[PDB]
UniProtKB/Swiss-Prot annotation:
<feature type="binding site">
    <location>
        <position position="668"/>
    </location>
    <ligand>
        <name>Fe cation</name>
    </ligand>
</feature>
<dbReference type="GO" id="GO:0102299">
    <property type="term" value="F:linolenate 9R-lipoxygenase activity"/>
</dbReference>
<dbReference type="InterPro" id="IPR013819">
    <property type="entry name" value="LipOase_C"/>
</dbReference>
<comment type="function">
    <text>Plant lipoxygenase may be involved in a number of diverse aspects of plant physiology including growth and development, pest resistance, and senescence or responses to wounding. At pH above 8.5, only (9Z,11E,13S)-13-hydroperoxyoctadeca-9,11-dienoate is produced, but as the pH decreases, the proportion of (9S)-hydroperoxide increases linearly until at pH 6.0 it represents about 25 % of the products.</text>
</comment>
<keyword id="KW-0560">Oxidoreductase</keyword>
<keyword id="KW-0479">Metal-binding</keyword>
<dbReference type="GO" id="GO:0031408">
    <property type="term" value="P:oxylipin biosynthetic process"/>
</dbReference>
<feature type="binding site">
    <location>
        <position position="477"/>
    </location>
    <ligand>
        <name>Fe cation</name>
    </ligand>
</feature>
<dbReference type="InterPro" id="IPR036226">
    <property type="entry name" value="LipOase_C_sf"/>
</dbReference>
<dbReference type="GO" id="GO:0005506">
    <property type="term" value="F:iron ion binding"/>
</dbReference>
<comment type="pathway">
    <text>Lipid metabolism; oxylipin biosynthesis.</text>
</comment>
<feature type="domain" description="PLAT">
    <location>
        <begin position="11"/>
        <end position="123"/>
    </location>
</feature>
<dbReference type="GO" id="GO:0016165">
    <property type="term" value="F:linoleate 13S-lipoxygenase activity"/>
</dbReference>
<keyword id="KW-0444">Lipid biosynthesis</keyword>
<dbReference type="InterPro" id="IPR027433">
    <property type="entry name" value="Lipoxygenase_dom_3"/>
</dbReference>
<dbReference type="InterPro" id="IPR001246">
    <property type="entry name" value="LipOase_plant"/>
</dbReference>
<dbReference type="InterPro" id="IPR020833">
    <property type="entry name" value="LipOase_Fe_BS"/>
</dbReference>
Length: 817
């Protein structure tokens, strides 16, 4: 009596050597236990041969036949051990036992000698702890214990140990004191989400900073391999910082290309005829995977970037006040604008430190289309993009840097009767303290279409967008998605068994997150990394995100809560989503509520399948340990806050899962995939400002009058950092062809529970339904103003589906790039 089995695997390089005694499997009983209650284990069974039957098997996968000596007396198998005797590791896809038991593995199996304990895999059945078959209970807990490790040791490539550590690996003090950075996390001064522990040990000069490493470890299965090298987008950041950036820098050091852009056409040239660079620079770029997909080239001297979506219909539309305001609700960073319910706007900052903080904007100077200020306030037509209190504490130190000058800005917006937003004033604030050496002062700038006044207003918009791009990159994007999510990924693997229903519900939403984050700590947010060298704050960039994290609230990440907290919607039970938008045609929010509702329905239908009552949640030992750790360790610097859900009810479980899935999928997609589409034209999304407004009677002032484009270009991001920044956002705005989107799973057998599978199928049908609805919105002529704007760019960032590439649409399951 033998059990026919089929093993599917993928050789490292993407067959006969797997035969003989190279690979052994041992079935484990889920019903028959030894003298210790542990499922009985069969004999070592090696692969018998290659199965070349079923056409249903692609992706460089190969199937192997195998038969197990398993009598009905050994009970029913529910798990199995596997040992790889070969030198090289292989990727185990699955095991299928006929007469059907399925095992979804998708895990790298290294040589048996590298493992402390034998790799164990479970059948695709789902069990809360109290439902674990008795013979698998100890195996279940031992595997979790193996995943947690002991909190010590330098992690190796094949390790599968999940643990936490602070952000003490960004500075490079051993190379230079100038690259020393404060540790983020673990202090009241610098609170911060934790990240995955790597354990490389301390630097030589600072026992609190982790030494450098050529490879930043992530548990093995978190490091996603790809069939196509072009899909390994995450490695592009490393290549860009380590290889391409130096190549670009040499071209400028050698004066082979003008150091600065001299006109707007010089910028447009980048995606038209291209930029000519030294042959050796082109040759350095053209052969790199991922990087070579970023530019078209003649193979000799030309690099051509792709035409950004924002200029595809009108190359000048970005300069309109209409587009400036529209992007606050349908642009790359559509989630910062707030309702303004009083006037003038107020500040909570200390005047003793920054000087009188009262606003200089006068109500009578504003054009509110005939409305009085009281009418605008009462009708909820006044809004603002407020970076005054956020930036003021950092303005002095930023402006002390050689090539950086910024203002803490505030923009007032009026919601017109036609439903579009219009900018009516920009306040450019600077701190003032007795003894300041600078004579520059704060000022208010009003809209202007002609003369030098129009140039000053255009520059004021640039200062505002430099604040916005910095806040978007560091807070809306990095902190709120990438960084805030990692602690939950770690806790999930450490406390929820692969058999756990919540593990199955949440893990698809973590795909590639730890991997891109580790590569980010190494090349994106590190000392002298991409962000520090391309954005305004320089060496103060990441710590600014720590200051902002002091105010991060998990429950305020829920879309309705966010909209209400920002004063852009009010609670209204008579509405489908329970909230009424104050800007009715707010694309991000309107489309977002649809996706939010679909995820909610899915979570509300899934949870009840495994938890009947609130008591079943309080009594799930794994679930309680998971949440307790996620909060007290993962986001431990905020463990003293009262807003954390308790997770003692079905309601709380649904809430926590819904928010986690929202952040990982739709929120990240909405703030991530519009980076190159909107920011690919540096004038539309400047990452830095290098000078304050000029004083009358100076050559700089005369320049605003005689050469406004040059005045603008000298103020924003320089040409070299612009080339580096455009390259990184082009990578980050690209969808890998092997992405798994919302409504999809990487395997149709993730669970054997038909009820869960049916619920998931309904969720995907609902997303398709939603996409048709969003298409109708974009085609509705009455919504053209905010959904398309003068740039005529349909808001498709929350469309659920997408083909590969730089598409400006599609919601992946996770923070995958
Ligand atoms: Fe991202």
């Amino acid at each position: 009596h033998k059990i026919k089995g089929t093993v599917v695997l993928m050789p490292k390089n993407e067959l006969n050597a797997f035969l003989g005694r190279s690979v052994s499997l041992q079935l484990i009983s889920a019903t028959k236990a030894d003298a210790h209650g542990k499922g009985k284990v069969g004999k070592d069974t090696f692969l018998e041969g290659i199965n070349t039957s079923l056409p249903t098997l692609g992706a460089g996968e190969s199937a192997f036949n195998i038969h197990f000596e398993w009598d009905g007396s050994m009970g029913i198998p529910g798990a199995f051990y596997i040992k790889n005797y070969m030198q090289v590791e292989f990727f185990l896809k699955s095991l299928t036992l006929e007469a059907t038991i399925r095992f979804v593995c998708n895990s790298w199996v290294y040589n048996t000698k590298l493992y402390k304990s034998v790799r164990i895999f479970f059948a695709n059945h789902t069990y809360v702890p109290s439902e674990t078959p008795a013979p698998l209970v100890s195996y279940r807990e031992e595997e979790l214990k193996s995943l947690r490790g002991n909190g010590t040791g330098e992690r190796k490539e094949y390790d599968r140990i999940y643990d936490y550590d602070v952000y003490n690996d960004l500075g490079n003090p051993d190379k230079s004191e100038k690259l020393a950075r404060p540790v983020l996390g673990g202090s009241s001064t610098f609170p911060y989400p934790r990240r995955g522990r790597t354990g490389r040990g301390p630097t030589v000069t600072d026992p609190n900073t982790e030494k450098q490493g050529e490879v930043f470890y992530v548990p093995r299965d978190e490091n996603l391999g790809h069939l196509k090298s072009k899909d390994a987008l995450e490695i592009g950041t490393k290549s860009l910082s380590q290889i391409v950036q130096p190549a670009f820098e040499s071209a400028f050091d050698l004066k082979s290309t003008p150091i600065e852009f001299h006109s707007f056409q010089d910028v447009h040239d980048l995606y038209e005829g291209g930029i000519k660079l030294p042959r050796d620079v082109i040759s350095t770029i053209i052969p790199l995977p991922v990087i070579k997909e970023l530019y078209r080239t003649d193979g000799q001297h030309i690099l051509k970037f792709p035409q950004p979506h924002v200029v595809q219909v009108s190359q000048s539309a970005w300069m309109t006040d209409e587009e400036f305001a529209r992007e606050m609700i349908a642009g790359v960073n559509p989630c910062v604008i707030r309702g303004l319910e009083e006037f003038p706007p107020k500040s909570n900052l200390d005047p003793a430190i920054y000087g009188d903080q009262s606003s200089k904007i006068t109500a009578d100077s504003l054009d509110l289309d005939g409305y009085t200020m009281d009418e605008a306030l009462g009708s909820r037509r006044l809004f603002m993009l407020d970076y005054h209190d956020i930036f003021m504490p950092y303005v002095r130190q930023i402006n002390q840097l050689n090539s950086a000058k910024t203002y803490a800005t505030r923009t007032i917006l009026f919601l017109r009767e036609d439903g579009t937003l219009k900018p009516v004033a920009i306040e450019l604030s600077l701190p003032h303290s007795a003894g300041d050496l600078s004579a520059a002062v704060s000022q208010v700038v009003l809209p202007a279409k002609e003369g030098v006044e129009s140039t000053i207003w255009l520059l004021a918009k640039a200062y505002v967008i430099v604040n916005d791009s910095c806040y978007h990159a560091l807070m809306s994007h990095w902190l709120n998605t990438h960084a805030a999510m990692e602690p939950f990924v770690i806790a999930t693997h450490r406390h929820l068994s692969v058999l756990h229903p919540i593990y199955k519900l949440l893990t698809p939403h973590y795909r590639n997150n730890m991997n891109i984050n580790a590569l980010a700590r190494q090349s994106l947010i590190n000392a002298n990394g991409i962000i520090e060298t391309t954005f305004l704050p320089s060496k103060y960039s990441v710590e600014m995100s720590s200051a902002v994290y002091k105010n991060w609230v998990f429950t305020d990440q829920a879309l309705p809560a966010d909209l209400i907290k920002r004063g852009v919607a009010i609670k209204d039970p008579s509405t489908p989503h329970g909230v009424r938008l104050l800007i009715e045609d707010y694309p991000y929010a309107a489309d977002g509520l649809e996706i939010w509702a679909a995820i909610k329905t899915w979570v509300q239908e899934y949870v009840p399948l495994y938890y009947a009552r609130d008591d079943d949640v309080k009594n799930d030992s794994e679930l309680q340990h998971w949440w307790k750790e996620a909060v007290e360790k993962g986001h431990g610097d905020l463990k003293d806050k009262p807003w954390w859900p308790k997770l003692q009810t079905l309601e709380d479980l649904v809430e926590v899962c819904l928010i986690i899935i929202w952040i990982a999928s739709a929120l990240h997609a909405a703030v991530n995939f519009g980076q190159y589409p909107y920011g690919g034209l540096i004038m539309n999304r400047p990452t830095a400002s290098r000078r304050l407004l000029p004083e009358k009677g100076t050559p700089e002032y005369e320049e605003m009058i005689n050469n406004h484009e040059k005045a603008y270009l000298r103020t924003i991001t320089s040409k070299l950092p612009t080339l580096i920044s455009l390259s990184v956002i082009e990578i980050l705005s690209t969808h890998a062809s092997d992405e798994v989107y919302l409504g999809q799973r990487d395997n149709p057998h993730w669970t054997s529970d038909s009820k869960a599978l049916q619920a998931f199928q309904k969720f995907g049908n609902k997303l398709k339904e939603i996409e048709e609805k969003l298409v109708r919105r974009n085609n509705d002529p009455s919504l053209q103003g905010n959904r398309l704007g003068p740039v005529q760019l349909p808001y498709t960032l929350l469309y659920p589906s997408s083909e590969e590439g730089l598409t400006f649409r599609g919601i992946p399951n996770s923070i995958s790039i």
